[PDB]
Each structure stands twice: as C-alpha cells, then as structure tokens.
C-alpha cells in the first residue's frame, strides 16, 4: 500500500515548498516521490510528520548516506551530529554535545547573563548607526555568532575582527553549498568525486570554513588549561579526548573535533539570527505589535534593565510573538531528511526501509487545519481570549523525535533575551522613504527574509 505520487522534473526546485503544496491537495499527507534513483516520501501535516518520527521514531532516526562529506574529514567515528547516521558516533555526540551545553550554564543564570552582555554590544553597534538604514543581517549573525562562539571555543570577536569577519562569511558560503546542484549530484552520483577537479570545486567554502577553525583550534589547544574543569565545549571535547586514547570505538577523536566543532558553531549562528532578521522584519511591518511588546517590556522589566529569562513567565504577549516570528517565519521549511531503518506504516500507507522522508514542517506550522490564519502574522495564534501563552502542538519549527534540534533550549533563550533587548531600546520602522519590504523570504534549505533595510531609533537618552 504505497503513497500516492506523479517526479524527476515535476519539482520545482526554485520554490520547492510552495509545489509540495499543489501535490499535497492532489495526492494527501503522505506522497510520493522519486529524485534521482532516490525514492522519497514527503510527510506533511502534523500528525504524519508525528507517526513517523515518534510513533515510528525507532525506524526514522537515520540519515541517507552522503559520501561526499568524505572530504571533510567524515568517518564511522567521526560523524558529526547533524549529518551523523543513526548509531553510536552519533549517540555520543549527540548526549555529549546536550549535556556540555547544559554543564556551561545552559538552563542556568550564567548564561543568560553572557547573551545580555553579548545583546548589549549589539545594541551599542545598533545605536552607532545614527539612526540611518542599514540592513541589520549582519550583525545579528555577529552577536549570535559570539555565544556559540562562547560556548563552543570559549572566547567572543570583536565585529571588526577581520577572522571573524571571514568565519562568519565562509560559513554562510558552506551553508549555499549543502543546497548547490553540485553537492547533491556527487553525493547522488558518487563516482564523479575522484576527477580532481570536481573535488578541488566542491565543498570549497566548507573545507575553507574548517580549515578556518583548525586555526581557531590550534590556538585553543595552546592556551587550555587541562588543570582547570573545561570552560567550553571544546575542552570538554579535549578531556574526553585524552581519556579516550587507545580506544578505536570512541568519537572523541581528532578528526570529529573539527567537525562536532564546526556543526554546533555553523548551526549556532545561521538559525537564530535569520530568526531574528525575520523578528525584525516583522516588527516593522506590523509596528502596532512592535508598540505592544515594547508595552509588555516596560510594564515588566523597565527601560534601564536588562532582560532576564525568569521574567518570560510574566511576558506572554512577547512570547507569543517570538513564537509567531518563527512559526511564520519558517526558517527550515522541509526540515532535514531522515531515512527509515525497517519498514514503516504512516497514515496507512506503507513505506519501504531505505526510504528518504522529507518531514514537511512548513506544512504544519502554517496548517490551515490548525492555525486560525495561518499566512499572516498573528500573535493571537499562541494567545488566548485572556492574553495567555498557549503553544499549540503544531508549534514544531524544531522537529520531532530523537533527532528533534537539540539547539532548541539555547534558541529559545537566545531569541527572548535578544529581542527583548533589541525593542527594549529601540523602536524600529521601515526607512522614511523606501518601499514596504516584501514578507516572504528567499527559499534554499534555510528561508530567510528578502534583503530589506529598517531605521533603529533609541526609545531614551539615560
Ligand atoms: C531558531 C533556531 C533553530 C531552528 C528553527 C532549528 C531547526 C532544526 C531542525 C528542523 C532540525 C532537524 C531535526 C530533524 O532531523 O528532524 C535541527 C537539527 C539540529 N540542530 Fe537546529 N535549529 C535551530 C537552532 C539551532 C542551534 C542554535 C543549534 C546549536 C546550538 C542547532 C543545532 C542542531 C543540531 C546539532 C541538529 C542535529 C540534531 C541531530 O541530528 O540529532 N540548531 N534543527
Ligand atoms: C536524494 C534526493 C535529494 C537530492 C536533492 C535533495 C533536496 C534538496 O537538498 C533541497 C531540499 C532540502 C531539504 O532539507 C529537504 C528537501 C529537499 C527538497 C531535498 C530532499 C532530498 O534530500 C533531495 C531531493
Ligand atoms: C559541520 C558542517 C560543515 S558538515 C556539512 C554541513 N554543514 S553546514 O555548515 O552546511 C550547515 C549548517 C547549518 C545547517 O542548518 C541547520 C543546522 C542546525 N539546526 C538547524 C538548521 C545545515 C548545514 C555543517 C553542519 O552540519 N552544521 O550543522
Ligand atoms: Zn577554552
Ligand atoms: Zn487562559
Ligand atoms: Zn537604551
């Protein structure tokens, strides 16, 4: 009992989610489809996307293989996270990374008041703009950048820093090359990967973005202080490194360093700042929400004092709009790929192993089933008559099952503080003379709003 279906040519690729959408009102929730040799099934809604990677999460945990990571170093024990095939690299890793974060002061104060700090120097950066346009991308990927930098490598760059500068270009540049034609048809194809040439092309940013941290690395290792419990991840790693000697069955290894490294430093700054760009973008699209949280931060936190995570519990309108700004922005609308490890039964169709699932998460955060309207921006959707918080379950920007973003915990408070931070000291509107910038974004594997330019006016003097 298959998923209905058309394939090889009737997808679009220049706007892939919006043609899942004419084939989910032709064949349903779960269909069909066969790319390149590949057989593909999409979910869609949250109930498949929910019996596939919880019910069924044993047998959905999995990634499809992909040879071409070969060149960054990528092996059975040196995998990564978010590309790691489901087992024991990825285990370890994955519970590593989790409970490191949490151990350098993740669910605790210490933390929130590093984002606080790190929100104020980008409010200052703000401010030195005089109140001219500029397109405020940049330096959201800089101040979120830092506290994975934080977190990860145990020290923050200044936004003139030239290296800094280069990581963060060289990483927007590897993130455009896991979606380039390029990269799939080697990955696809995978013979083509010895001609010289197509290796030496390939990856460029992405062997450049690690060559970049090796670097970054090096220093580390020159200035750890073994002798001192781990002040970041990378210590951390460090340690468990050296434990680990002689044991060929453990990740903690050179070669997955780099990239464990490189996974939660790449996908600490991309996510969050593009989710903020979006914020932005739709605070001054709808200012009488940007007045309205700006109400909520005066009547809770003041003017003068920085935002603090215990205070959210008393903001639901400020939370409810940073759950709108990522539920309508949607910054990973067809998720990342899973593959099944036996046979799988959703929505009573029956799906082969080996299968790639591509969990359609746009089609749930903007069901028109669930959300009152769902392509608008609407608070409302995670409020109440009464003005309560209320997440609905179709509230998965993040996925689901064991694979379910194990950023989450840190985006979360990453958003809050720097959005409250952000309208708390500033009021932010489209510049006095420009067009009204558009409210969709530019699709590739992450959505971000189409390049616009806002005006930041200080609300206060002292
Ligand atoms: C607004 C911010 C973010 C959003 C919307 C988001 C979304 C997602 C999604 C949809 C997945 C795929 C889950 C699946 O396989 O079904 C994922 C995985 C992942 N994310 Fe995030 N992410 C965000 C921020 C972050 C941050 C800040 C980090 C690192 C600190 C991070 C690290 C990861 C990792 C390592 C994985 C792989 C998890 C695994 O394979 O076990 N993400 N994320
Ligand atoms: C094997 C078949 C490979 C080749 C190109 C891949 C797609 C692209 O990468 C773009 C996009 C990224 C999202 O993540 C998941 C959805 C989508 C459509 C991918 C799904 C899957 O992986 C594809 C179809
Ligand atoms: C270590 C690697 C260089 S290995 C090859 C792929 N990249 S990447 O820089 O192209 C990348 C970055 C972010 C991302 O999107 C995310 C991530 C996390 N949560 C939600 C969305 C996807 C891919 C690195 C990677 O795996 N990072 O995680
Ligand atoms: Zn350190
Ligand atoms: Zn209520
Ligand atoms: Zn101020």
């Known amino acids: 009992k298959l998923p209905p279906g058309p394939n090889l040519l009737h997808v679009d690729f220049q706007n892939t989610p919006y043609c899942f959408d004419q084939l989910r009102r032709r064949f349903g929730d779960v269909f069909s489809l ?30 499809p293989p992909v040879p071409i990571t070969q060149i960054l170093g990528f092996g059975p024990r040196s995998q990564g996270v978010f590309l790691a095939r489901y087992g024991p690299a990825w285990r370890e890793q994955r519970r590593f990374s989790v409970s ?44 979120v950048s830092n506290v994975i930098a934080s977190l990860t490598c145990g020290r923050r760059f200044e936004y003139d820093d030239p290296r800094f500068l280069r990581l963060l270009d060289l990483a927007q540049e590897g993130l455009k090359e896991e979606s380039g034609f ?51 991840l990378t210590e951390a790693f460090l340690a468990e490194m050296e434990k680990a000697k002689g044991n060929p069955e453990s990740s903690f290894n050179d070669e997955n360093l780099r990239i464990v490294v490189a996974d ?3 996908a600490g700054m991309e996510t969050t700042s593009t989710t903020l760009a979006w914020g932005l973008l739709l605070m001054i699209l709808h200012p009488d929400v940007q007045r309205r949280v700006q109400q909520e931060i005066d009547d809770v936190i003041g003017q003068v004092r920085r935002p603090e995570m215990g205070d959210q519990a008393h903001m639901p309108y400020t939370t409810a709009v940073i759950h709108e700004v990522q539920r309508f922005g949607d910054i990973v609308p067809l998720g990342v790929t899973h593959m099944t490890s036996r046979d799988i039964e959703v929505q009573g169709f029956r799906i082969p192993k080996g299968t ?24 409302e959707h995670f409020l109440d008559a009464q003005g309560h918080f209320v997440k609905p379950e179709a509230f998965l920007p993040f996925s689901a099952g ?47 709003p189409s390049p616009y330019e806002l005006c930041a006016v200080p609300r206060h003097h002292h």
């Open 264 to 266: 939660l430093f790449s």
């Open 34 to 63: 066969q790319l390149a040799w590949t057989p593909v099934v999409v979910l869609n809604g949250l109930a498949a996307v929910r019996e596939a990677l919880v019910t069924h999460g044993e047998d959905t945990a999995d990634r």
């Open 402 to 448: 064991r694979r379910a973003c194990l950023g989450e915990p840190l985006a979360r408070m990453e958003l809050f503080l720097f959005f409250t931070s952000l309208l708390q000291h500033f009021s932010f509107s489209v510049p006095t003379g420009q067009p009204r910038p558009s409210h969709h974004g530019v699709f590739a594997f992450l959505v971000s």
């Open 356 to 379: 790639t699932l591509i969990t359609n998460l746009s089609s749930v955060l903007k069901d028109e089933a669930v959300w009152e309207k769902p392509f608008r921006f609407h608070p």
């Open 182 to 232: 390029l990269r799939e048809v080697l990955n696809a194809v995978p013979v083509l990967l010895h001609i010289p040439a197509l290796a030496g092309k390939v990856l460029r940013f992405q062997k450049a973005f690690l060559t970049q941290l090796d670097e970054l690395l090096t220093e580390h290792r020159m200035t750890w202080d073994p002798a001192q419990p781990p002040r970041d």
């Open 100 to 143: 490191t974060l949490r151990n350098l002061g993740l669910g605790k104060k210490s933390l929130e008041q590093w984002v606080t700090e790190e929100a104020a120097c980008l409010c200052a950066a703000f401010a030195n703009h005089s109140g001219r346009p500029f397109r405020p991308n940049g330096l959201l990927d800089k101040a």
